[PDB]
């Protein structure tokens, strides 16, 4: 299953600090498989594979995933 996450979205999980500045800085302490995509905003956008995040951030991630955006607007 594909489920990448952005630093700004990690700035809210408990295990991870509340500011992307701490996540990206801590990202070097490990280097979770981050896929870059210089085609969204304009400056190499960093991402994080949810499968690469530990369990404390994963479980917390799926938590704030309740209703993301459109697509499943039909509440499934």
From Swiss-Prot:
<feature type="domain" description="HTH Mu-type; 1-alpha, viral IAS binding">
    <location>
        <begin position="1"/>
        <end position="69"/>
    </location>
</feature>
<comment type="subunit">
    <text>Homotetramer. Part of the transpososome complex composed of a DDE-recombinase A tetramer synapsing the ends of the viral genome and the enhancer element. Interacts with target DNA activator B; this interaction brings DDE-recombinase A to the transposition target site. Interacts with host ClpX; this interaction remodels the transpososome for replication and is required for the flaps endonuclease activity of DDE-recombinase A.</text>
</comment>
<comment type="function">
    <text>Responsible for viral genome integration into the host chromosome. During integration of the incoming virus, DDE-recombinase A cleaves both viral DNA ends and the resulting 3'-OH perform a nucleophilic attack of the host DNA. The 5' flanking DNA attached to the ends of the viral genome (flaps) are resected by the DDE-recombinase A endonuclease activity, with the help of host chaperone ClpX. The gaps created in the host chromosome by the viral genome insertion are repaired by the host primary machinery for double-strand break repair.</text>
</comment>
<comment type="similarity">
    <text>Belongs to the mulikevirus repressor c protein family.</text>
</comment>
<protein>
    <recommendedName>
        <fullName>DDE-recombinase A</fullName>
    </recommendedName>
</protein>
<comment type="function">
    <text>Responsible for replication of the viral genome by replicative transposition. During replicative transposition, DDE-recombinase A is part of the transpososome complex. DDE-recombinase A cleaves the viral DNA and the resulting 3'-OH performs a nucleophilic attack of the host DNA. The 5' flanking DNA is not resected and an intermediary structure is formed. This structure is resolved by target-primed replication leading to two copies of the viral genome (the original one and the copied one).</text>
</comment>
